[PDB]
């Protein structure tokens, strides 16, 4: 469903990322991993772009999008949002900050939502590809504070790759909250720069040794099935696909 709504707040995070907060319509229900298409008439009256909903649907009045400035439309959105914020804060208030009007269409599903019904999962993501796993990790927390054993997911192995140390800041609060509340060791968090994070989990360096990682995760969960969920570059997808076949892991072709 297509509805007018508003960017009611934004943050400016490292590597040119917008942390948009968007007013959630009453009708709009989503599941973690879902994306939507957004139109910003101030940027283009006719163009729709897709973004992962980086918030969990248990958060009640806003959706969140983490949009990285990589080209024309995302660059213009970044520059509109920067300038509007630079201005209203040079020119105090009198009002609240006005919403940027936008239309949203969705939500749209992804097979990543099947994590909640998996026994053992590997999440692998690179850069802003983290966004659906940000939604999903937050959901996994809310759901364990609600129905403690009602979920069949027993172990989440998380691997987040970045070229730039500063990119870890997008979700370091969330990764910290996971390291606080994870007494029962549901999660194995793994950050690779390709610590200074400030987590108990030490930031590793270089391209991960995926052959050794798969060998280990297979050994831990045999003779059970492991599901690999991947959001990132296609060169990495080809390698993860060969490795999923070698060790009998679930894979969805999402990379062309
Ligand atoms: C399901 C889904 C979820 C997504 N979730 C997110 C998300 O959460 N956050 C996020 O930031 N992004 C996300 N994206 C990506 C996104 O939707 C942007 O449209 C793209 O990220 C922004 O388009 P743009 O106009 O700003 O860039 P473009 O101007 O289209 O440029 C995009 C890239 O293509 C290159 N390019 C452009 N033209 C050419 C050319 N002629 N030759 C060669 N290379 C060219 C550019 O150099 C750049 O690397 C998602 C995409 C999908 C499908
Ligand atoms: N899953 C999908 O549907 C899909 C489809 C296409 C792309 N994407 C998007 O692509 C983004 C990243 O791709 P990009 O074009 O921006 O490339 P990129 O900048 O090269 O990717 C950024 C990160 O990926 C690592 N990486 C790249 N190729 C790798 C490989 N073969 N093996 C291991 N690590 C590798 C980089 O490490 P190095 O510094 O060593 O390069 C870096 O940490 C993600 O944010 C994702 O959202 C998603
Ligand atoms: O930055 C990207 C991105 C950049 C260029 C190309 C694709 C993406 C991207 C794609 C993506 N897909 C694309 C393929 C999909 C939905 C999941 O639709 C058909 C199979 O599954 N899911 C994504 C989630 C977060 C970020 C991104 C993405």
Q: What is the 3-state secondary structure (H, E, C) of 151-196?
A: CCCCEEEEEEEECCHHHHHHCHHHHHHHHHHCCCCCEEEEEEECCC
> Was 68 annotated as part of a binding site?
yes
Alpha-carbon Rg for the chain, nearest whole angstrom, is 19
How crowded is the C-beta side of 181, counted as CA atoms within 13 Å?
A: 15
CATH code of 2-108, in short, is: 2.40.30.10
Which residues in the chain precede a discontinuity of more than 2.5 Å between C and N? Answer: 194
The response to whether 113 counts as a known ligand-binding position is: no
Q: Which of 16, 40, 46, 49 to mutate to test the pocket of ligand 1 (most atoms within 8 A of CB)?
A: 49
For residue 220 the two structure tokens come to: 């831990």
| 181: β partners | none
66 marked among binding-site residues: yes
Is CATH 3.60.15.10 correct for 111-247? no
The bridge status of strand 35-39 relative to strand 204-205 is: unpaired
Peptide bond into 223 cis (omega under 30): yes
Give me the resolution in angstroms, 1 decimal.
2.5
Domain boundaries, the chain: 2-108, 111-247
| Residue in the block written with tokens 């027993």 | 154
254 within ligand 3 shell (Cβ under 6 A): yes
Helix (H) or strand (E) holding 49: strand 49-52
What gap in Å lies between CA 240 and CA 226, rounded to an integer?
Answer: 13
2-108 and 111-247 share one fold: no
Q: Which residue is it, tokens 């990495």?
A: 236
Copy the structure tokens of residue 175: 């990764």
β-partners of residue 120 are: 155, 226
Residue 251 tokens, joined: 């894979």
């Amino acid at each position: 469903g297509s509805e007018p709504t508003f960017v009611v707040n934004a943050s400016l995070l490292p590597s040119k990322v917008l942390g948009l907060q968007v007013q959630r319509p009453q009708s709009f229900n989503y599941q973690p991993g879902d994306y939507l298409f957004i139109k910003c008439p101030g940027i283009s009256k006719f163009e729709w772009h897709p973004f992962t909903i980086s918030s969990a649907p248990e958060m009640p009045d806003v959706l969140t999008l983490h949009i990285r400035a990589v080209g024309s439309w995302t660059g213009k959105l970044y520059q509109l949002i920067r300038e509007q914020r630079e201005e209203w804060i040079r020119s105090g208030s009198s009002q609240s900050l006005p919403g940027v009007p936008v239309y949203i269409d969705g939500p749209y599903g992804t097979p990543s939502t099947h994590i909640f019904e998996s026994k053992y999962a590997i999440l692998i993501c690179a850069g802003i590809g983290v966004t659906p796993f940000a939604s999903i990790l937050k959901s996994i927390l809310h759901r364990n504070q609600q129905n403690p054993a009602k979920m069949p997911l027993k172990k989440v192995h998380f691997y987040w790759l970045n070229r730039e140390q500063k990119a870890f800041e997008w979700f370091v609060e969330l990764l910290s909250k996971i390291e606080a509340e994870d007494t029962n060791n549901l999660f194995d968090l793994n950050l690779y720069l390709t610590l200074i994070t400030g987590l108990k989990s030490r930031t590793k360096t270089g391209r991960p040794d995926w052959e050794e990682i798969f060998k280990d995760v297979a050994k831990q969960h045999a003779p059970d099935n492991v599901e690999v969920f991947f959001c990132g570059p296609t060169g990495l997808a080809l390698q993860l696909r060969h490795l999923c076949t070698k060790y009998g892991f679930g894979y969805r072709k999402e990379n062309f």
